[PDB]
Each structure stands twice: as structure tokens, then as C-alpha cells.
Amino acid sequence: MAKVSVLNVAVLENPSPFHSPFRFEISFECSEALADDLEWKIIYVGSAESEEFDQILDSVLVGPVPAGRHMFVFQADAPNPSLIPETDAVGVTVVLITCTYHGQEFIRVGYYVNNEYLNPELRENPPMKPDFSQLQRNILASNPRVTRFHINWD
Amino acid sequence: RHRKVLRDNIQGITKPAIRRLARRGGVKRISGLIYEETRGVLKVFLENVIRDAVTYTEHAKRKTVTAMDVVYALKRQGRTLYGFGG
Amino acid sequence: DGEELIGDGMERDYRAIPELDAYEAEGLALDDEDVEELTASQREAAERAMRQRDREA
Amino acid sequence: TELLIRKLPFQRLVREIAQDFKTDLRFQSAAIGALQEASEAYLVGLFEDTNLCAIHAKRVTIMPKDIQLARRIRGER
């Protein structure tokens, strides 16, 4: 069975401006020691239409991994607005934290993200070209989706 | 005048199934576009699982897909939870 | 601009239709033919075949 | 009533799809049942996400976009 399970993800500094970093406090249990690296990544879904609009904001390595319960802080810069299809910029999208071992993704933690104007005028009459300096990002942290995949450890 | 013999028409999943599924999931209202979308999604899911299942069946050198082959394929699909362990 | 799921009238979606609600025999293995399970040598072979396919794919 | 997808159309769909991968296949009835149970579970889960998704977009009407997001959140690609 799985050698690593996620205990918690704390979503910090949320809601926040669109342009502010994502900040996650990741806590996990390792039941059997891993000599090789866990690779963690944060992926922004730029568009529901296609995976081609995914942005990998950042990637971090953790290893070797002792048995026990552990925590680290994973921060990543906000996505590049220019690469987001304009119709999908405002409103709901998804951000993902994934973990990979020996090149196989064994866990995917997703959150819904609402990008909203707080300015009533903008809310009412949003510009054709979104103003990202006016968008607030609200990560829906009370509703994580944790998907596990069986992988071959060793 | 002129009586017609009927032909079996079961093809794919009709709309009420999709409404039933959506209601199970707490959905109160759907666009008409939901219908085709749901079919598409189901078709992909089934296409993947079945593929893997048949492969298991091919490795057993039998022409019959068993329950276990399916169980294994579903294990390959990934399991989604609504919160964190611990 | 959608369709209301509730649903005065929604009862129509829940009718029992035994003709449609039962599996038929066609395409099914009944009751005796090779059901023999995968073992290991065949199993892990399959999982490797599929993992490598999902590499190539 | 606990009806979701009707059994017979589901069986016919499975056989139609299986036709492409290998021919003259047979299924245990239990195999079709397991497939159906997982299919219904998967679709119902997608719909739950879809409802949440629409709830935070201030919509009462769920859209194909919602379903697509629910799939991405589970790692279909």
C-alpha cells in the first residue's frame, strides 16, 4: 500500500489578491522511509476547456523521507495572467497540489478557486479585458478534493 | 391501415438517467448542454476502465471478463475523497 | 436558462420498467466457462504493459 | 426509487464500447454490475462537485464547464 498519506493542507493568506503567491502548509505521514525524492507541484488550471492552459507555478523536492509525521511550507507565485483565456479568467477555476514518487503521481489535492471583482461597478459591468489588479482570489479551502492513485513504490 | 413491426432501439443512455444522476448529486437545475456532456464523460470513463479490464482478460488467456478484472481496473482509476486522512 | 430538476412531474423519471431494468443473457458468461483468475505473473505483467502504454501514450 | 442508469441500456453500452478493444468477449454479470456501480458513483460525485462549483459562481444552473472542472480536480487528462 501507499507509503505516504497527506494529513492536512492549510491554505494560508486566503482570500487574497489575484497577484499574491499561493501559500500552503502541507503535512503528511510517511509509514515507510523513502530513500528517493518526493516531488511536489502546484498547478493552476487556466481553462476548463483544455489542459494546455495549465500553468505549473512551482515544483519542490523533498527527500530522503524518514518515517514519521512531517510538515513543510510550499509557496508559489501567482499564474501569468497573459496565458489565461480571457473568458475563463473571472469566476471559478481549479488549483492543484500533486505529489510524485518515481515519476508516478500518487496524490492530487484540488481546490475550487473563485476569482471575483470586489468593486461593485466591475462586478456589475466587467471589462472585456479583465483587470487582474482588481480581482480577489478566494480558494475554497473547506472543500478539498483528495484523489489517490495506486503506484509502484520501489 | 398498414401495421409496422418495431425494431429494438436501445442505444446509449437517455435523458431521465442523467436527471436521476444529477438529482442524486444535489443538482437542482441543468443546462440542456449537460445531457451530451454527461454522455461524453461516461463514455470516456467506461472506455478507460474497460480497456484496462480487457487487457487483464487478455493476460489470463480467456475471452471472458470477470468481476476481478474490473475491480483491478477501477483500482487503477484513482479514488477521490472529500477530506484529508488524519 | 436551464431545466428545473424538481420537479412536480419528476416522478415520471422513476418508473420501473423490468424490460430495461434487467441484464440480458447475450454477451454474458453463463454459467460455466473460463473464469480463472489472473495469478501474479500475469497480473504484474499486465500492469507493466499498461504502465508502459501510458508512458507511450 | 434508487434507479440511476437503467441496467439493460448500460449493458448494451458496455458491450458496444468493449467491441472496439477485443471481439467475441463475454462478461460475468457481476463484472457488468461492478462497472455500473462505479460508473454511477463517478457520475454522482462529478455532479456533487458540479453543484458546489455552480454554488460559488452564484449560478443555480450547472454548465458543461462545471463538469469539466470536476474532472480536472480528479486528474483526468
From Swiss-Prot, chain A:
Keyword Cytoplasm attributed: yes
Q: How is it modified after translation?
A: Phosphorylated by TLK1 and TLK2.
Q: GO CC terms on record?
A: chromatin; cytosol; nucleoplasm; nucleus; protein-containing complex
Q: Does the keyword Cell membrane apply?
A: no
Q: What's any GO biological process attached to this entry?
A: nucleosome assembly
Q: State which residue ranges cross the membrane.
A: none
* Expressed in which tissues: Highly expressed in testis and at lower levels in colon, small intestine and thymus.
According to the lineage, what is the superkingdom?
Answer: Eukaryota
Where is region (Interaction with CHAF1B) located?
Answer: 1-154
Region entry Interaction with histone H3: which residue ranges? 1-154
Q: Which UniProt keywords apply?
A: Chaperone, Chromatin regulator, Cytoplasm, Developmental protein, Differentiation, Nucleus, Phosphoprotein, Spermatogenesis, Transcription, Transcription regulation
Which compartments is it annotated to reside in? Nucleus; Cytoplasm, Cytosol
Taking the record's annotation, the residue ranges forming a coiled coil are: none
Q: Which GO terms describe its molecular function?
A: histone binding; histone chaperone activity
Q: What is the effect of changing D37A?
A: Abolishes CDAN1 interaction
Subunit structure, per the record? Answer: Interacts with histone H3 (via C-terminus), including histone H3.1, H3.2 and H3.3, and histone H4; the interaction with H3 is direct. Interacts with the CHAF1A, CHAF1B and RBBP4 subunits of the CAF-1 complex. Interacts with HAT1, NASP and TAF1. Found in a soluble complex with NASP and histones H3 and H4; the interaction with NASP is probably indirect and mediated by H3-H4. Interacts with CDAN1. Found in a cytosolic complex with IPO4 and histones H3 and H4. Interacts with CREBBP.
Q: What family does the Swiss-Prot or TrEMBL record give for this protein?
A: Belongs to the ASF1 family.
Name under which the protein is recorded: Histone chaperone ASF1B
Q: What is the lineage of its organism?
A: Eukaryota, Metazoa, Chordata, Craniata, Vertebrata
Q: Which gene encodes it?
A: ASF1B
Portion of the full sequence shown: 1 to 154 of 202
From Swiss-Prot, chain B:
Q: What does this protein do?
A: Core component of nucleosome. Nucleosomes wrap and compact DNA into chromatin, limiting DNA accessibility to the cellular machineries which require DNA as a template. Histones thereby play a central role in transcription regulation, DNA repair, DNA replication and chromosomal stability. DNA accessibility is regulated via a complex set of post-translational modifications of histones, also called histone code, and nucleosome remodeling.
Domain of life of the organism encoding this protein: Eukaryota
At what positions is N6-butyryllysine found? K15, K28, K61, K63, K75
Taxonomy, top ranks, is: Eukaryota, Metazoa, Chordata, Craniata, Vertebrata
Which residues are modified to N6-lactoyllysine?
K15, K61, K75
Query: Which residues are annotated as modified residue Phosphothreonine in the UniProt record?
Result: T64
Keywords of this protein's UniProt record, alphabetized? Answer: Acetylation, Chromosomal rearrangement, Chromosome, Citrullination, Disease variant, DNA-binding, Hydroxylation, Intellectual disability, Isopeptide bond, Methylation, Nucleosome core, Nucleus, Phosphoprotein, Ubl conjugation
> What residues bear N6-glutaryllysine in this entry?
K15, K43, K61, K63, K75
Task: Report residues of the Glycyl lysine isopeptide (Lys-Gly) (interchain with G-Cter in SUMO2) crosslink.
Answer: K4, K15, K43, K63, K75
Q: Which residues carry this modification: N6-(2-hydroxyisobutyryl)lysine?
A: K15, K28, K43, K61, K63, K75
Modified residue annotations for N6-propionyllysine: K15, K28, K61, K63, K75
Provide the protein name.
Answer: Histone H4
Supply one GO molecular-function term: RNA binding
Source organism per UniProt: Homo sapiens
Swiss-Prot record, chain C:
At what positions is Phosphoserine found? S41
The entry's localization annotation reads: Nucleus; Chromosome
Source species, domain of life? Eukaryota
PTM description: Phosphorylated on Ser-41 by ATR in proliferating cells. Ser-41 proliferation is increased by genotoxic agents. Phosphorylation by the CDC7-DBF4 complex during G1/S phase is required for the initiation of DNA replication.
Biased segments, Basic and acidic residues type: 44-57
Question: What other facts are recorded?
Answer: Early fractionation of eukaryotic MCM proteins yielded a variety of dimeric, trimeric and tetrameric complexes with unclear biological significance. Specifically a MCM467 subcomplex is shown to have in vitro helicase activity which is inhibited by the MCM2 subunit. The MCM2-7 hexamer is the proposed physiological active complex.
Q: Which family does it belong to?
A: Belongs to the MCM family.
Subunit structure and binding partners: Component of the MCM2-7 complex. The complex forms a toroidal hexameric ring with the proposed subunit order MCM2-MCM6-MCM4-MCM7-MCM3-MCM5. Component of the CMG helicase complex, a hexameric ring of related MCM2-7 subunits stabilized by CDC45 and the tetrameric GINS complex. Interacts with DBF4. Interacts with KAT7. May interact with MCM10. Component of the replisome complex composed of at least DONSON, MCM2, MCM7, PCNA and TICRR. Forms a co-chaperone complex with DNAJC9 and histone H3.3-H4 heterodimers.
Question: What is the designated name of this protein?
Answer: DNA replication licensing factor MCM2
Originating organism = Homo sapiens (Human)
Curated annotation (Swiss-Prot), chain D:
Which residues does this entry mark as bearing N6-methyllysine?
K7, K22, K65
Q: Which residues carry this modification: Phosphothreonine?
A: T23, T50
Keyword tags: Acetylation, ADP-ribosylation, Chromosome, Citrullination, Disease variant, DNA-binding, Hydroxylation, Intellectual disability, Lipoprotein, Methylation, Nucleosome core, Nucleus, Phosphoprotein, Ubl conjugation
Keyword Acetylation found: yes
GO MF term set: nucleosomal DNA binding; protein heterodimerization activity; RNA polymerase II cis-regulatory region sequence-specific DNA binding; RNA polymerase II core promoter sequence-specific DNA binding; structural constituent of chromatin
Instruction: Please list the residues that carry the modification N6-glutaryllysine.
Output: K22, K58, K65
In this UniProt entry, the residues modified to N6-(beta-hydroxybutyryl)lysine are K22, K65
Question: Which Cys residues form disulphide pairs?
Answer: none
Residues bearing the modification N6,N6-dimethyllysine: K22
Q: What is the effect of changing I55V?
A: In BRYLIB1; uncertain significance
Q: Which residues carry this modification: N6,N6,N6-trimethyllysine?
A: K22
- Positions of post-translational N6-succinyllysine modification: K22, K65
* Record PTM N6-lactoyllysine, positions in chain: K22
Question: What's an example GO BP annotation here?
Answer: muscle cell differentiation
Q: What is its main location?
A: nucleus
- UniProt KW Isomerase keyword: no
Record localization = Nucleus; Chromosome
Outcome reported for the amino acid change (mutating N51S): In BRYLIB1 and BRYLIB2; uncertain significance
Q: Where are the N6-(2-hydroxyisobutyryl)lysine residues found in this chain?
A: K7, K22, K65
Assembly state and interactors? The nucleosome is a histone octamer containing two molecules each of H2A, H2B, H3 and H4 assembled in one H3-H4 heterotetramer and two H2A-H2B heterodimers. The octamer wraps approximately 147 bp of DNA. Interacts with HIRA, a chaperone required for its incorporation into nucleosomes. Interacts with ZMYND11; when trimethylated at 'Lys-36' (H3.3K36me3). Found in a co-chaperone complex with DNJC9, MCM2 and histone H3.3-H4 dimers. Within the complex, interacts with DNJC9 (via C-terminus); the interaction is direct. Interacts with ASF1A, MCM2, NASP and SPT2.
Q: Which family does it belong to?
A: Belongs to the histone H3 family.
